[PDB]
Design a protein around this ligand. Structure first.
Ligand SMILES: O=c1c2cc(-c3ccc(F)cc3)cc(O)c2ncn1CCCCCn1ccc2cnccc21
Ligand SMILES: [Cl-]
Ligand SMILES: [Cl-]
Ligand SMILES: [Mg+2]
Length: 213
């Protein structure tokens, strides 16, 4: 088996079914004690929780699911009837993510979109019935952060106040995205310094609130 399968099995065997917090704790325990993995982790996760609670978004798009950690983290804090769409290019990871969400009891709040962001973003309006997004969590290929932000805008998916929250802006890093949003009058930006998941290595999140054309 794969690392990702091992993580899922550990959750199934050490967390309580239907209890998202127990699922997060199990993942973070496994990844601290047994095998590192690229989940957002608890340090940056606490910042995400604070942001989610501030905005109470109705419709969230996540770019990059992996094993479902961040999807569980966000979905557990959504209000009744609020929804998360999460895009995952790797089909084996899509399947882990769906199983993770199922175990957590969050499957009614979350939809997986299978494919690449550059192919799926232009389908959101017509196939997934999206008007505009309230929040976007970027956690996919670093070279796609900037082009997908620009694509979201082109497709009319951003509104005044849409919150972009980006993982890994320091490590591995997203220099073009950071330079762009920080230099643009169309975004209001804030950097949240933190640590790489499971590691004593500095990383951070960037929040960039869209302000219109
Ligand atoms: O690579 C990383 C990563 C690496 C490290 C990391 C740090 C330090 C290290 F030393 C090593 C790795 C730490 C992290 O937190 C990471 N988070 C996310 N990702 C992106 C994973 C692959 C996304 C593929 N993908 C998923 C949906 C989707 C849609 N369209 C296109 C592509 C798409
Ligand atoms: Cl994650
Ligand atoms: Cl952590
Ligand atoms: Mg990440």
């Amino acid at each position: 088996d794969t690392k990702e399968q091992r993580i899922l099995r550990y959750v199934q065997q050490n967390a309580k079914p239907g209890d998202p917090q127990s699922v997060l704790e199990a993942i973070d325990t496994y990844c601290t004690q047994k095998e590192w993995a690229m989940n957002v982790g608890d340090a940056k996760g606490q910042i995400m929780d604070a942001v989610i609670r501030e905005y109470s978004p109705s419709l969230v798009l996540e770019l990059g699911a992996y094993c479902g950690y961040s999807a569980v983290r966000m979905a557990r804090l959504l209000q009744p009837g609020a929804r998360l769409l999460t895009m995952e290019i790797n089909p084996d990871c899509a399947a882990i993510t769906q199983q993770m969400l199922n175990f957590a009891g969050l499957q009614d709040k979350v939809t997986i979109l299978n494919g690449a962001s550059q192919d799926l973003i232009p389908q959101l309006k017509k196939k997934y019935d999206v008007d505009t997004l309230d929040m976007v969590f970027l956690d996919h290929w670093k070279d796609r952060y900037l082009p997908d932000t620009l694509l979201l805008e082109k497709c009319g998916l951003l509104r005044k106040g849409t919150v972009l929250l980006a993982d890994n802006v320091i490590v591995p890093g997203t220099p073009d995205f950071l330079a762009y949003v920080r230099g643009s009058s169309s975004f209001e930006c804030t950097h949240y310094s933190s640590y790489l998941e499971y590691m004593k290595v500095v990383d951070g999140l960037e929040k960039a609130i869209y302000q219109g054309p």
